Structures are given as structure tokens and as C-alpha cells.
């Protein structure tokens, strides 16, 4: 078949869009007349000398902005800002219309956006710089739709989603072929958790432009993850990596996470689990040979090293991530959770409970941190406190499928005795969730259910005891056999009772 | 081990929130959208020559609904004769 790569959509496009759009050499006419100069961006192009030459020759603003874009690709954000400023100082822009000055103001706006993005810090200062540049551009030329796109992006960064959505509605009124408007709308919808609504926009953008940056396939894979079709997500991410093999390590990280999830939830045997887990570790390490300080990779490796009893290195990585990415609360929550898990072996119940609470406060979506908090409450013999916390969490999250939480609730209520009905409900929910997940149902839940049903239904209790015995197999104990025999004796099953007693 | 099983169930669900770095959109990222002032319009009109057919078959497979039938005509107004 036809190879799926960047060259595929290169050949799909006409040769005008193939070579010219990716030229690393810029042709600049000279002020002397027909003389021109060609400077290759592969070589080390100096910003100051190039700007001085451009000002002397008074070249078209397109060349200035193209050089700025290339220096952006080089990462020279300061150099691109210098290019923009000296272009504003150039005679061409001063003698041109206000439209060119507005376009360069919007370019400086994009420069501020990139400066904020590349650092994820000083957000207010760069946002104010970008806002001032965008306001100047709009005042100089308000008819440019790029000013509206910049306004919408500014609203999105300040979480003014309604105004950005209105701006994208206006852009859709102007034209429905605007790819950037589609991307911004889909980003806002994903931020508003409208995964499917953003997914239609992702598909439309991908169909319109398969070579558009940012990659729509990243959002499509996120939606497939939200729609459980993670296999298609991985396939689309592989296609994106083929199209974008550079500066897209996040796709490889997502692929590694998907592989780890598949290994966890699909390995049919221990040997297959080991093979898949080691392959995922090798792929993660190969990605780490490019970047060795990525906080998410360290957090992921912390799980493996905690499973390897390397708690000291887990603490080192957690502290390093906390120092680097304290802005991200999710990393703080994960580090606190792992510190509490490490201290659990040390049984620092007060310290582990405090760490679990801090993890919950950093990121409330971390259910595991709350479950560890409840477990630590149990460790400190806080039966009532753990019960109150668990009831609060369940009543706030009645739709959450925390099977172990429901099992613990059932056990606590069985110990209480008076709340047997909630215990039955929670144990049945745990049984159903385990059956849906194809996970081994704990026979202890069956024993608790039989104990509860002793005073309600001997038939259901006996059936649950039989199910627990079938799960145990050779693990049947003396108490289970004695209770089965007593059940059959009460059922007048003399033969079966005698066999169970034997 | 109960918390380990809970982690395995959860895996890295809530850790994908930071991975949204691909959602950010910047104009300068595209190489050829800026080389001319109207390169945006040219590239928006460069893909009008392309369609779903020109998409790669594997990328077409990525277009999954969240075939024509012979008995559903498209309406007309002048007919023929």
C-alpha cells in the first residue's frame, strides 16, 4: 500500500507547497536594485547583522516575518522579538500601512505566547505583554481575523472560555474553513470536558489538514481514551509520530502509558505480564535517553522503583519533581501519595495520613490518595473517623467505581452490624464490579454476606458460602465446612451435612 | 497490596491532564502558513484540491463515527426530459 509518512501528504500536495514552504534559505533583495542576497538558515544566522542588513536594504516585511518564524523554529524567541522590534524600527513598516504594523504586533503576541509556553512561568507578565501587543494590533487593524484568534487564545489562557467561544462563533460566521478556529474551539471543548464535541472538530481539522500543527491526532487519541477505544488512539499516535518524528516526545509518553495500561489489564499470564512490562520499561528508558528530567517520566518510574523496594530513590525523584513542577498540583499529589506509600512500610501513620491529605488537597481527582487516607485512619484505629470519611466520599461520589472502597464499607458495616443493608449493597456492588472487570472476587466478601444473611436468608447465605468454597477450591477451611454442614443440617440435608462434617 | 491493585486499576488516568500540551495552538508552528501574508488563505485553499479520498487509508480508518446506498438520491429541481 501507500506508505503513511510525511512524504505521503507532501506528494499529495502540489510541489509549490512541498519545497517552498520548508525552504531554509531566504532571498532578500538589496537596496542597490536588482541585487539580492540569499542566507541559509542552516548556518548560524546572526539576528543583529541580519536585521541591520534588512533595514539597510529595506526589504519587504514578509522576509522579516519569515526570518522571525525561522528563528522561532530555532528557539531564538529573544532573537525573533529583536527582529520584530527592529522591523518596527525599519523604514518599510513606518512607510507601510497600519496593517503591517498590526501583523508584526500580532507576531510579537505569538512570541510572548511561545515565551510563556516554553517556560510555563511568569504567566502574568507575558500575558500582559501579549495583551498590549494584540490591543495595539487591533487598534491599528481590527479587520484581521488573526487578532480575533489572538483574543480568543488570550481568553482561553485566562479561562474566559465564553468570550473565546463567542470569538470562534464569529470566525465560523466569517468562514467555516478556518483550521485554527476549529483547533481553538476543540481545545476549549476539551477544557470543558466536551470530549465528543471536541472530537468532531478534531476529525474535521484532520480531514482538512493532515499536516497541521498542533496535531489533531493527539486530541483524537485523548478522545479515544475517553471513549475506551485506546487501540485506535495508539494507532493514531503512531501515525502522528510517523508524520512528526521530532519534538513530539509527549506522543511517545502516551504510547508508553497505553502499553503499561494494556499490560496491567490484559496480560493473560505471569510470563506475558513480565514480557510486556519489561518491553514498556525498555521503551520508556529509550525515550528517557532523550530527556532524563521529565517530571512525568520520573513519577512513572517511581511506581516501578517503589515496587522494587527502592523507596529512597522514590523519595529522591518525588522531591526533585516537587521542586521543579510545584506549579502543577497533580505532580504534587502524586509525590505526596508516593511518600505516604513509602512511609506506610515505616508505618508513619500520622505522617502517611498527613501526606495523603496533602495529596488530596493538591489534586482532588486522586482517589488512590483518599483511599490511602482511609487506610491510614484504619491503621490509627480510627474506626468511626474512617467510617465518616468513607461515607462522605461515597455520598459525594456515588457513581465512582471504587470496588475496594465499597468492600471496605461493607466490612465496616458488618462489624457495626446495625448497617447490614448498606453492607449487602456495597458487597453486591463490589461483586458486580469484579465480575465486569474479570477480577478474582474475594471470598471474604462472600463470607461477610453469608454472615449477614444468617439472620435474613439461610438460602442466600448458603449459596454465597458455596460460591466462596468454589473460589477457594483446596483453600477450604474448617469453619467454612462446618458452616456448610450446619446449613445443610438446618435444611435437613442429612447426607450433605454429614459429608461436610466429614 | 490493596492499594497496589487500586493503582493498577487506576494506572495513570488523572495524569493525562498535563499531557494536554498538544492542545495549545500557535500560528508560527506551521512552516508555510506565514511565508506570505496570504499564505494562510493559500494553504486553506491548498487543501481544497484534496479531499477524503486523498487521505491515507490508515488515516481514513482513524475517521470512525462516534457508505452510500443506491436508493437515496440527492434532490433536484429541474429534473430532465
Amino acid at each position: 500500500m501507500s506508505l503513511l509518512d510525511q512524504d505521503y501528504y507532501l506528494s499529495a500536495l502540489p510541489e509549490d507547497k512541498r519545497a517552498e514552504l520548508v525552504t531554509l534559505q531566504l532571498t532578500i533583495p538589496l537596496k542597490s536594485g536588482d541585487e539580492v542576497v540569499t542566507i541559509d538558515f542552516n548556518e548560524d544566522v546572526d539576528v543583529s547583522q541580519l536585521c541591520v542588513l534588512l533595514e539597510s536594504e529595506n526589504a519587504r516585511p514578509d522576509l522579516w516575518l519569515s526570518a522571525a518564524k525561522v528563528f522561532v523554529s530555532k528557539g531564538n524567541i529573544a532573537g525573533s522579538q529583536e527582529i520584530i522590534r527592529k522591523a518596527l524600527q525599519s523604514n518599510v513598516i513606518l512607510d507601510s500601512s497600519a496593517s503591517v504594523t498590526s501583523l508584526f504586533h500580532n507576531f510579537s503576541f505569538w512570541l510572548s505566547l511561545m515565551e510563556y509556553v516554553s517556560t510555563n512561568s511568569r504567566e502574568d507578565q507575558f500575558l500582559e505583554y501579549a495583551s498590549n501587543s494584540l490591543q495595539a494590533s487591533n487598534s491599528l487593524d481590527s479587520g484581521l481575523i488573526l487578532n480575533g484568534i489572538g483574543n480568543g487564545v488570550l481568553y482561553a489562557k485566562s479561562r474566559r472560555y465564553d468570550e473565546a467561544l463567542k470569538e470562534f462563533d464569529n470566525l465560523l460566521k466569517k468562514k467555516s474553513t478556518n483550521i485554527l478556529a476549529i483547533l481553538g474551539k476543540a481545545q476549549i471543548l476539551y477544557k470543558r470536558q466536551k470530549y465528543s464535541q471536541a472530537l468532531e472538530l478534531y476529525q474535521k481539522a484532520l480531514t482538512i489538514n493532515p499536516l497541521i500543527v498542533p496535531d489533531p491526532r493527539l486530541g483524537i487519541g485523548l478522545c479515544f481514551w475517553h471513549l475506551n477505544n485506546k487501540q485506535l488512539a495508539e494507532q493514531a499516535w503512531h501515525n502522528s509520530l510517523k508524520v512528526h518524528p521530532q519534538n513530539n516526545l509527549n506522543t511517545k509518553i502516551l504510547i508508553c502509558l497505553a502499553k503499561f495500561d494494556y499490560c496491567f489489564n490484559e496480560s493473560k499470564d505471569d510470563d506475558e505480564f513480565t514480557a510486556l512490562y519489561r518491553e514498556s520499561l525498555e521503551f520508556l528508558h529509550s525515550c528517557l535517553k532523550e530527556d532524563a528530567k521529565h517530571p512525568l517520566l520520573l513519577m512513572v518510574l517511581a511506581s516501578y522503583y517503589f515496587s522494587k523496594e527502592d523507596y529512597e530513590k522514590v523519595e529522591k525523584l518525588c522531591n526533585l519533581v516537587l521542586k521543579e513542577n510545584s506549579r502543577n498540583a497533580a505532580f504534587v499529589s502524586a509525590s505526596h501519595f508516593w511518600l505516604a506509600r513509602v512511609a506506610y512500610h515505616k508505618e508513619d501513620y500520622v505522617q502517611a495520613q498527613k501526606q495523603f491529605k496533602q495529596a488530596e488537597d493538591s489534586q482532588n481527582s486522586n482517589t488512590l490518595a483518599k483511599l490511602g487516607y482511609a487506610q491510614c485512619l484504619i491503621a490509627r484505629n480510627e474506626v468511626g473517623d474512617a467510617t465518616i470519611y468513607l461515607e462522605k466520599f461515597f455520598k459525594e461520589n456515588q457513581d465512582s467505581k471504587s470496588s475496594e472502597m465499597m468492600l471496605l464499607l461493607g466490612i465496616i458495616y458488618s462489624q457495626s452490624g446495625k448497617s447490614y443493608y448498606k453492607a449487602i449493597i456495597f458487597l453486591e456492588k463490589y461483586v458486580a464490579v469484579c465480575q465486569e472487570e474479570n477480577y478474582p472476587i474475594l471470598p471474604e466478601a462472600y463470607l461477610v454476606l453469608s454472615r449477614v444473611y444468617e439472620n435474613k436468608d439461610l438460602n442466600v447465605a448458603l449459596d454465597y458460602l458455596m460460591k466462596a468454597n468454589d473460589i477457594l477450591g483446596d483453600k477450604a477451611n474448617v469453619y467454612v465446612l462446618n458452616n456448610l454442614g450446619i446449613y445443610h443440617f438446618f435444611r435437613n440435608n442429612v447426607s450433605q451435612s454429614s459429608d461436610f462434617f466429614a | 497490596r490493596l492499594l497496589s491493585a487500586l493503582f493498577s486499576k487506576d494506572n495513570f488516568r488523572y495524569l493525562m491532564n498535563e499531557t494536554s500540551d498538544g492542545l495549545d495552538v500557535n500560528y508560527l508552528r506551521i512552516p508555510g502558513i506565514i511565508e506570505n501574508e496570504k499564505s494562510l488563505g493559500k494553504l486553506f485553499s491548498s487543501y481544497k484540491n484534496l479531499a477524503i479520498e486523498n487521505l491515507h487509508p490508515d488515516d481514513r480508518l482513524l475517521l470512525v463515527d462516534p457508505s452510500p446506498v443506491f436508493f437515496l438520491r440527492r434532490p433536484q429541481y429541474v429534473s430532465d426530459g
Binding site: 496491567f264 490484559e266 496480560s267 493473560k268 499470564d269 505471569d270 505480564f273 513480565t274 512490562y277 519489561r278 520499561l281 525498555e282 528508558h285 528517557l288 535517553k289 532524563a292 528530567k293 518510574l301 516501578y304 515496587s307 522494587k308 523496594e309 530513590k313 529522591k316 525523584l317 526533585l320 474479570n438 477480577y439 478474582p440 | 497490596r1 490493596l2 497496589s4 491493585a5 493498577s8
Partner: peptide, 30 residues
Amino acid sequence: KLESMVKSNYRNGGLDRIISKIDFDFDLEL
């Protein structure tokens, strides 16, 4: 039988021991 075959140590809770049985050397900074 794949439904019963998949039930093994990691599902039973011996996942940590399995990871301990998998040894790998990283180029750790810390």
C-alpha cells in the same frame, strides 16, 4: 478458558513480587 487463565498473581495481588522478579538497570540521575 481465557477468563480463568488471566486470573493470576498480579490480579490476586502478587503484582509487586512480579515486578521485583523483573530486574532492569536505568541511567538514573538520582
